């Protein structure tokens, strides 16, 4: 309880601003005029593009 510890605190904001830090997700060629479950920087959902 008296030995030194190194503390790192990370703070981020989600899904309300343009983003520059993402995880390891491989992209996919996009298609239009069909309803598909999409993913735009973590924004999921199904709809017609």
């Amino acid at each position: 309880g008296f030995q030194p510890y190194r503390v790192v605190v990370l703070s981020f904001e989600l899904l309300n601003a343009p983003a520059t830090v993402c995880g390891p997700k491989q992209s996919t060629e996009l298609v239009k005029n069909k309803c598909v479950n999409f993913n735009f920087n973590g924004l999921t959902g199904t709809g017609v593009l």
């Binding site: 309803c35 479950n37 959902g45 199904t46 709809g47």
Partner: protein, 49 residues
């Protein structure tokens, strides 16, 4: 508007001419019929919910 009419016990009023009037009366009958889908309102493109 006031009329201040008086009472006479031996005098009667009798009309001497007549007219024909046309009046309008509008009544509602029906209202719009609406169907509500339970899902696609509480849910939609979401099989988890």
């Amino acid at each position: 508007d006031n009329q201040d009419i008086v009472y006479s016990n031996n005098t009667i009023a009798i009309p001497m001419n007549f007219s024909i009037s046309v009046t309008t009366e509008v009544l509602p009958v029906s209202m719009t019929k609406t169907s509500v889908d339970c899902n696609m309102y509480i849910c939609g493109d979401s099989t988890e919910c």
